[PDB]
Amino acid sequence: HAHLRAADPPEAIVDAAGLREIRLVFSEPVVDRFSTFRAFRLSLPENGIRNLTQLNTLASELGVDTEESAHHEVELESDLSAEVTLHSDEPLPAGAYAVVWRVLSVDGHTTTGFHAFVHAGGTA
Amino acid sequence: HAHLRAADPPEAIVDAAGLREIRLVFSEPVVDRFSTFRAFRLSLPENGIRNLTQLNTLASELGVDTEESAHHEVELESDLSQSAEVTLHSDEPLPAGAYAVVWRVLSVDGHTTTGFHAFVHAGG
Amino acid sequence: DLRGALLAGNCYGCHGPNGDSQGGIPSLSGLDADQIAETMLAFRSGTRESTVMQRQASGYSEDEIASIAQHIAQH
Amino acid sequence: AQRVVVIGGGFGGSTCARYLRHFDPDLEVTLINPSDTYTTCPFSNLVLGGERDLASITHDLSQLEHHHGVRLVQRWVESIDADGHRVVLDDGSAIGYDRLVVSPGIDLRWDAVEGYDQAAQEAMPHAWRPGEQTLLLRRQLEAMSDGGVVVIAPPANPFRCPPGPYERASLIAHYLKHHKPRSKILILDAKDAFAKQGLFQTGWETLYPGMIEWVPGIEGGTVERVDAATGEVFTPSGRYRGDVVNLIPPQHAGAIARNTGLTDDSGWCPVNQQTFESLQIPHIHVIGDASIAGAMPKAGFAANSQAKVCAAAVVAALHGFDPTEPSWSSTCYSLVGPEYGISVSAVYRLDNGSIVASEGAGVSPGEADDHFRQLEAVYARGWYDNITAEMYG
Numbered sequence: 101h102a103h104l105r106a107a108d109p110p111e112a113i114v115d116a117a118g119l120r121e122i123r124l125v126f127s128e129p130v131v132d133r134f135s136t137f138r139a140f141r142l143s144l145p146e147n148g149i150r151n152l153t154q155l156n157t158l159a160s161e162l163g164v165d166t167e168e169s170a171h172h173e174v175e176l177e178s179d180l181s182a183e184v185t186l187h188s189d190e191p192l193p194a195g196a197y198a199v200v201w202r203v204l205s206v207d208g209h210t211t212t213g214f215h216a217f218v219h220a221g222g223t224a
Numbered sequence: 225h226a227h228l229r230a231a232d233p234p235e236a237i238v239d240a241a242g243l244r245e246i247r248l249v250f251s252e253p254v255v256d257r258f259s260t261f262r263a264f265r266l267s268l269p270e271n272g273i274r275n276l277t278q279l280n281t282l283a284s285e286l287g288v289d290t291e292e293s294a295h296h297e298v299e300l301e302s303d304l305s306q307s308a309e310v311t312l313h314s315d316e317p318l319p320a321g322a323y324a325v326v327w328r329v330l331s332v333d334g335h336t337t338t339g340f341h342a343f344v345h346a347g348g
Numbered sequence: 349d350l351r352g353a354l355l356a357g358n359c360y361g362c363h364g365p366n367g368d369s370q371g372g373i374p375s376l377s378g379l380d381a382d383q384i385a386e387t388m389l390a391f392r393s394g395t396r397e398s399t400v401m402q403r404q405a406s407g408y409s410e411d412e413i414a415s416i417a418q419h420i421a422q423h
Numbered sequence: 424a425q426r427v428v429v430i431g432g433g434f435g436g437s438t439c440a441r442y443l444r445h446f447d448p449d450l451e452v453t454l455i456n457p458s459d460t461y462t463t464c465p466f467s468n469l470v471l472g473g474e475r476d477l478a479s480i481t482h483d484l485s486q487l488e489h490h491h492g493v494r495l496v497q498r499w500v501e502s503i504d505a506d507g508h509r510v511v512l513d514d515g516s517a518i519g520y521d522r523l524v525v526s527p528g529i530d531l532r533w534d535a536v537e538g539y540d541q542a543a544q545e546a547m548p549h550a551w552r553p554g555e556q557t558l559l560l561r562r563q564l565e566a567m568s569d570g571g572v573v574v575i576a577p578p579a580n581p582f583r584c585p586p587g588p589y590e591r592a593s594l595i596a597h598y599l600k601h602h603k604p605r606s607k608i609l610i611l612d613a614k615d616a617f618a619k620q621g622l623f624q625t626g627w628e629t630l631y632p633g634m635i636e637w638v639p640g641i642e643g644g645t646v647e648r649v650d651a652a653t654g655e656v657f658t659p660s661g662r663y664r665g666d667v668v669n670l671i672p673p674q675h676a677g678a679i680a681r682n683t684g685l686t687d688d689s690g691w692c693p694v695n696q697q698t699f700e701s702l703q704i705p706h707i708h709v710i711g712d713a714s715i716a717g718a719m720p721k722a723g724f725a726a727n728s729q730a731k732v733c734a735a736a737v738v739a740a741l742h743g744f745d746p747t748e749p750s751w752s753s754t755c756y757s758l759v760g761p762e763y764g765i766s767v768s769a770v771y772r773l774d775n776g777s778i779v780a781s782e783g784a785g786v787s788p789g790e791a792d793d794h795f796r797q798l799e800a801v802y803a804r805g806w807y808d809n810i811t812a813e814m815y816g
């Protein structure tokens with residue numbers, strides 16, 4: 101069904117100066133009305149995180165059905181035909197990010213997943 | 225030989241909203257008059273880094289000596305005569321980024337060493 | 349003549365030494381002038397669909413196709 | 424008994440040696456090559472993609488002596504005595520020639536991409552000469568952890584096998600897709616266009632969607648500097664890091680051609696377009712990648728093609744007859760995936776003293792079905808086994 105094949109920003113730590121959008125690419129197209137994307141800026145532990153496994157651990161805590169959580173959600177206007185670009189008006193501030201989805205293909209199958217990254221600031 | 229035994233921020237990705245203080249703890253005390261400390265926000269590769277080994281590699285091209293480089297220096301104030309506990313200040317807080325602290329230090333044992341410490345300041 | 353040999357030599361590049369294919373691409377050796385010429389021209393105009401034979405076949409004139417045809421069957 | 428000495432046992436030389444004996448079996452033909460064996464750069468991408476090993480693309484030259492009576496010398500040619508019509512070897516011995524065929528292939532320009540000298544090739548392999556390097560790069564791809572980035576940096580024209588880097592991407596992708604599905608490929612190109620671009624990109628979209636990013640020179644794709652220590656490539660669009668990086672530097676003619684004075688300013692060898700006799704040292708012929716052959720790509724098929732015309736021309740010159748009118752063909756097959764093949768193909772013809780493609784030449788059709796791609800894949804393996812049979816059977 102609808103798996104993620106590529107993401108921008110990549111699953112890496114990056115200098116994404118004022119990142120105003122996140123771009124996702126799926127294996128086949130994805131039905132708009134029925135599919136929901138949410139993005140969370142991660143609140144990292146006191147001790148911090150030592151690697152990407154731990155960031156991916158920290159993101160898998162989240163999900164589309166998630167009400168109370170440690171992390172701060174971000175307002176994204178979505179634009180869906182297999183590439184999705186989540187938009188924010190405001191440029192995103194520095195942070196470890198998670199994007200999370202429930203996504204309907206045209207065969208009626210649902211697929212959930214996440215894509216996490218670290219935006220480490222920088223300037224225009 | 226004065227080696228780094230501990231540091232804060234530690235070697236990780238951390239949310240550190242207003243970071244003004246970087247702390248180094250060395251294995252022996254260290255001579256103020258003959259020790260230098262510098263600090264840089266690392267300008268990451270376009271496609272970013274994927275772990276801490278890559279933070280370190282990138283950080284290690286710098287050192288107390290370096291001149292013009294890809295990276296951007298953050299002016300610091302040493303706070304120390306002899307001490308195993310070095311504390312580094314900036315008036316304003318630090319923007320988010322990958323940072324490298326590089327030193328040349330005289331131990332009380334008479335030996336000069338150089339080294340670096342790197343962390344990722346995610347904001348907060 | 350060498351003229352015909354050079355026109356023909358390149359066919360062995362894909363079709364194997366003196367038309368003996370190791371496989372995939374068909375063999376050439378067990379065919380006579382007439383068959384070769386008649387299908388070169390067939391590939392050339394489109395009549396016979398090719399993956400690459402028209403690209404190759406179109407590179408030759410009708411005269412050259414006859415020389416090539418002769419030389420492969422003779423040899 | 425008249426003598427022809429051929430330098431090199433690759434696509435050009437071995438084909439030349441065989442055809443020389445076919446065209447005049449009265450010649451004392453000696454072919455000189457450092458080794459009893461030859462590994463093909465063609466199909467080495469399938470080694471990188473873990474479909475075969477180096478043995479399966481290595482061939483014995485012994486057949487040339489055993490069957491076609493070409494004396495096979497396993498030495499390096501160090502020097503060419505053009506006047507004394509002799510060739511000096513690494514062992515100090517000499518071998519005399521009435522006519523010399525030089526087909527040495529390519530060398531990598533070590534002074535061209537800042538950072539990339541002979542020493543950089545262990546960490547940042549080119550693999551544009553096959554064997555040791557192919558092996559090094561594959562071992563890198565095997566050790567790379569899932570989720571890593573392979574960087575492929577092809578050079579500006581002209582270079583050996585213009586689609587080759589894009590098939591390399593394709594097949595590395597094939598290996599990544601089945602073993603390391605998170606992994607990414609990033610092409611930092613010096614050029615704003617590549618061979619069979621439409622075809623490769625459609626192939627990538629359908630076999631490896633999202634795996635492969637291509638950055639042209641015009642968008643800051645050009646490699647200005649590399650750091651072999653750190654897996655870092657420097658470009659006008661910024662610094663990039665690769666977990667594996669395949670740097671492919673600009674190229675020139677093999678040492679023997681350069682050192683002997685057969686090359687001109689460009690680092691390639693100008694040659695009579697009809698006879699492939701060197702426009703610089705009479706009685707030496709230059710074929711293959713080392714030659715300047717008009718329209719003809721620096722490809723294995725071209726070398727083999729040039730070899731035939733050349734054999735014919737040297738027998739012409741040795742028996743005091745005018746050279747004949749020549750014919751060539753070249754076809755570069757690329758495997759986008761093991762069962763997805765594409766081709767660029769042409770017949771060649773002298774036209775105003777320049778080698779030129781005939782009408783009809785072209786790349787595979789744009790809007791074709793899966794069966795078509797599968798067939799061209801089958802035919803690629805056909806070509807490979809066939810052409811090597813011709814050279815080494």
Ligand SMILES: *Cc1cc2c(cc1C)nc1c(=O)[nH]c(=O)nc-1n2C[C@H](O)[C@H](O)[C@H](O)COP(=O)(O)OP(=O)(O)OC[C@H]1O[C@@H](n2cnc3c(N)ncnc32)[C@H](O)[C@@H]1O
Pocket residue numbers: 430431432433434435436455456457461463464465466467468498499500501526527528529550551552553583584587591677678679710711712713721722723724725726754755756757
């Ligand atoms: C790197 C590459 C090349 C390639 C390809 C894919 C890759 C990854 N795919 C191809 C394809 O699909 N179709 C095709 O037609 N060509 C393809 N190629 C290109 C092909 O490798 C070259 O264009 C071809 O090798 C050129 O032939 P040439 O005869 O010009 O060069 P060579 O085969 O490397 O042979 C040179 C030999 O001579 C020996 N040598 C060199 N100098 C000396 C001296 N001084 N003394 C003695 N021997 C010498 C070399 O050792 C070598 O064996």
Ligand code: HEC
Pocket residue numbers: 355356358359360361362363373374375376383384387388397398399400401402404416417420752754802806
């Ligand atoms: C002279 C230079 C050449 C002659 C004469 C022929 N060929 Fe080829 N050839 C090639 C392929 C892959 C095929 C299968 C058809 C296709 O898909 O395009 C062929 C087919 C032929 C046939 C028909 C054979 C049959 O048994 O039906 C004939 C008579 C033939 N070819 C003659 C491939 C190539 C190639 C690849 C690089 C070259 C240079 C040539 N052929 C050249 C000649």
Ligand SMILES: [Cu+2]
Pocket residue numbers: 225226331333334335
């Ligand atoms: Cu000491």
